[PDB]
């Protein structure tokens, strides 16, 4: 049956106060083309009530018009909906499709409720179309390109639930289309030259964390963690990167230079016993090293305790002879007491407890680890990326975690070491070089396999992800494992915390 | 709309421009296509009259312009104005006349003239001289004329009407400069004459046929700018330290990591993490064959600790590629804070040798405890090869097996491009760096799995370039299927700076020629 | 729906070129006879964007 | 299909740009119940010209083939 | 030349449906008033495009 509505006028309202009304092209006037928001699917999944499509009034609606609407800058007039809809005689059941007016706001609507709007039912097994016109209800002359404008909208719902019969394959769903052309009292408004204006976002990469390379420790990535009764504020060097691709600290671009060193390697004397190695230190691409604005070559060691190290001669061409030593170096303030990696000079002792000129040092186990950072200038101040934060209340560092080698001495045992982004991370925003238009960004971590989201997130601006957990209380994740942007979220965004996974619920 | 000056311009300046008609007879818009278009598409009444800045809209006359110099170059059709380019891209076919006004209106003290001509479809491009433009139907006028000069551009036109395809060759409109430029008075350099162009159309230009807006991709595949001595290497995991090519070496390699093709699909055994090259993950056991339980067995496991399952590549992923004798560190896994470590050292025999057990690719592999502790589940992480060769080992002992392709082919005088890192070789009385090399370093594997790129044609141009001096160190080939090749004669190991970054191109065809640049040699005369 | 095109001339454009202009029997007009390139299929391995048939004028 | 010209009318040859009618795939086929896979769906296309269609110069051009090579299939 | 733009109607649209329809002072009518934003200077410095004033009705 026809609309409960009365015929809308179209352009003899914004006549005497837009600058100019212009028509358009009788060919795109009555052609049903299917529209922008064109496809929708029903499935036995759906319950009654599910909205299936919502549709706003206004030229982005149909294509052309669309593309039109690059042109001018305001519209007015009608348009003309229909929708098809692939069924089976399997398929049983009933759609409805309402028109809502401007200024009703959203609610939820019992599929009762939407009849009292005017509207249109079909049954899902129909091989015909259905026709619905949206007037354009106006409270105002008319229309300027502005998507917070109200006009009238189109809401599809399932007006009863699905119901498959046979051999039910759920893989089967009803496949919708919806199509529209502008109605003759369609009209834009003033020619704008508003020929093109877009912008864009941050993404990232869909590497699961146990795919990843770990950041301050070169090994893989084996934990996806927070926990509470760690340090909070941690002052790492090594993995910070802003989400604009600002690398903090001595942050290096690859994974192979992450706690490591070159140096020029020779045996002084002051002592007198040369058991101890001077490493004049080079960057680790053989380029000088000199003091800056970073506490020490990139990828330099930023924690403390006793580091066995292996040193290699450096390796230029095919047919260099190689020296290797190990030697253990104190990467921590102690005491009377040199080594300062920010003027570019450190000392190892050969564990006498070899090789010289220039060498490459790779990290080989920790002794007495402290995750604190080395006394990098031997008392003066230092240039330093600053604390990982801050935290709103009930918010924690979410950590990446590998493993190192700790030795003793009657005694190898792993010891954890976190980072704040997988190194993967780390190079692909210095390299998007994004830009950023808040303060963080909402992420959910998904497992993309199952569908199962895990949870949700804060990644703020400045290279480090929040969650909300109260618990005490180290918590684990799955570590396959994906995160999504999002949103942009204001800092002070709260997250979502949490629930015992246990749903179900009695009448009672 | 306009305004000159005239009022207050003196009489220094001539406000009308005043020329010779052009040798030229009127040409018919739409009336032609009517009969045989499938529509004859009107346009907006306002944009008809409306002399508005096309899209070629600017150009500059200056002292150090030489006659000659083309100042801007015409082709008749809807780009010439931007409302039409916009509704270009929901048409199919127009016809029609264009009216051009160019302006000018440099000071009284500045001298000069300009050519324009129209130059009809079907002669094709040809660098005309000044003397030359004179011979097509053209227009004279001093770079102070006041009014804007108008030039009707014609649609001489052998068919009925347009469609939007490269097979359409219209009129053009070239502008060059006909006397030199040159500023009276006190001559202040920075003077130029700065031009507009502006177009409407003729109420004969009429748009063709009613089609889908857009159908303009452009999905073009970038590099990230980072130096090879910046990045990590995807065979052996250290920094990269060279960049080279080395025509005696092996030309079509057939390395399991490091692979990837420009479009994100990985090959062979290639992992993402550079953490994960030529390392393993296993559960581990000590059975008794032979029965003195120095053999730890390793039952492989992905090394996220998944299981792993003989499939479509050559063993678990970044197990290594190559063959010798490989020391290996072996660890208990690192699960929680707390588990408690042994870590234990191995030589693995990676090479076919013989008799003969070891196949990665089923999942099982033997070292033994450099005897020459740990068990349950482990990490393998390569601490130095001995008697190294570039060969793959043999994956699956004696049966067929999974792998990428060998890297190639090349054309004739192509080589491949080497990104290289030294492991620790052992002796035995004497660790010596060994090369060791890879087709991209592993930021770059990284970059092209991720972005999934859409590739177009069978290569890409690169150009290596020094950012911090600007100078270009050479062009290479970047082939789809992930490797890049020079040309280059020498035989001759050659080596390149590492600092270093690539940049993109083109697509380019495969029989592409590269610039062979080196020899730095021109070795010759003339004079 | 109609195609958003606007119908395009025949013979009228190549009469004062051509040098006859030959016109075909009426029969023919309007009798819908299965064309050369006149058979195609659709089957599950086929994916979407696959081209079933091109044909050109 | 409409006459799209660029040109006055079209020569024997079809080596010339005319208009196309591309027919594809918008959605995947989907079958349902006892999906026998050995079910296709027959397609047929049929044509008559248009009132508008003329031939135009008259050619005694009434026969001329060629020939090609193949080989036998024959496993070796 | 001219404007492109067709002469814009004043209050004739209000009267119809404003509650009332309240006459100026006509010595404002017609006396030209400089803007808030009326001053700027043009400097041999300032390239084509640069914007030298911004107004709303």
Redesign the interface.
């Known amino acids: 049956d026809p609309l409960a509505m009365d015929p809308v006028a179209g352009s003899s309202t914004a006549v ?2 837009a ?2 009304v ?1 028509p358009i ?1 009788p ?2 006037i ?4 299917q529209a922008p928001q064109g496809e929708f699917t029903i499935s036995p999944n759906n319950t009654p009530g599910d909205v299936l499509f919502d549709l706003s009034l206004g030229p982005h609606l149909n ?2 018009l669309l ?2 609407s ?2 001018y800058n305001g519209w007015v007039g009608n348009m003309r909906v229909r929708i098809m809809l692939a069924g ?1 005689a ?1 398929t049983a059941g009933k759609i409805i499709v309402s028109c809502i007016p401007p200024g009703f706001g959203s609610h939820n609507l019992t599929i009762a409720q939407a009849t009292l709007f005017p509207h249109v039912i079909a049954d899902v097994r129909t091989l015909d179309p259905i026709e619905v016109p949206l007037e354009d209800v106006r409270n105002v002359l008319f229309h300027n390109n502005d998507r917070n404008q109200q006009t009238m909208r189109l809401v599809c719902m399932l007006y009863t639930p699905l119901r498959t019969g ?2 039910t ?1 759920d ?2 769903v009803v ?1 919708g289309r919806v199509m529209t ?1 502008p109605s003759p009292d369609f009209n834009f408004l003033f ?1 704008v ?1 508003a ?1 093109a204006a877009a912008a864009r976002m941050v993404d990232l ?4 964390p ?5 950041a301050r420790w ?6 996806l963690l927070v926990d509470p009764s760690l340090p909070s504020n941690p002052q790492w060097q090594n993995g910070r990167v802003h989400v604009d691709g600002t690398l903090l600290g001595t942050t ?6 992450v706690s ?1 060193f070159a140096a020029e390697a020779a045996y002084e004397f002051q002592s007198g016993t040369g058991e101890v190695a001077t490493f004049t230190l080079i960057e ?4 000088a090293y000199v003091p800056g604005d970073r506490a020490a070559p990139l990828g330099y060691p930023d924690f403390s305790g006793q580091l066995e190290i ?1 040193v ?7 047919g ?5 030593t190990t030697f253990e170096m104190i990467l921590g303030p102690t005491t009377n007491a040199d080594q300062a990696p920010y003027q570019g000079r450190v000392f190892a002792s050969v564990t006498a407890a070899l090789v010289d000129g220039r060498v ?1 040092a ?1 990290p080989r ?1 920790i002794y007495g680890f402290q995750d604190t950072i080395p006394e990098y200038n031997d008392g003066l101040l230092v240039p330093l990326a600053p604390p990982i934060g801050p935290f709103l209340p009930g918010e924690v560092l979410l950590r990446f975690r ?2 190192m ?2 030795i003793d001495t009657a ?6 070491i976190d980072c704040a982004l ?3 991370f780390v ?2 925003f210095a ?1 998007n070089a994004f830009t950023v238009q808040s303060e963080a960004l909402l992420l959910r971590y998904r497992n993309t396999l199952t569908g199962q989201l895990l949870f949700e997130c804060k990644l703020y601006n400045e290279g480090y992800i929040a969650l909300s957990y109260s618990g005490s209380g ?1 918590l ?1 994740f799955p ?2 494992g994906i995160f999504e942007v999002v949103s942009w979220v204001p800092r002070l965004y709260q997250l979502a915390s949490v629930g015992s996974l246990a749903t179900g619920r009695m009448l009672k």
């Not at 680790?284 to 380029?287: E, I, V």
């Not at 290699?312 to 095919?318: A, D, L, R, V």
């Not at 260099?320 to 290797?324: A, F, I, N, P, T």
């Open positions: 005497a106060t600058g100019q212009n092209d060919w795109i009555n052609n049903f083309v294509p052309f593309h039109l690059q042109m089976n399997f046979g051999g394959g893989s089967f496949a052309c020619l030259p020929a990469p869909v590497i699961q146990r795919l990843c390379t770990h070169p090994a893989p990535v084996y934990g290096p671009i690859s994974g192979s230079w490591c680790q691409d053989g380029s292996e290699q001669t450096e390796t230029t061409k095919t260099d002879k190689l020296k290797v490459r790779v186990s590998t493993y080698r700790q005694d190898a045992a792993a010891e954890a997988p190194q993967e190079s692909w390299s180290p684990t570590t396959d």
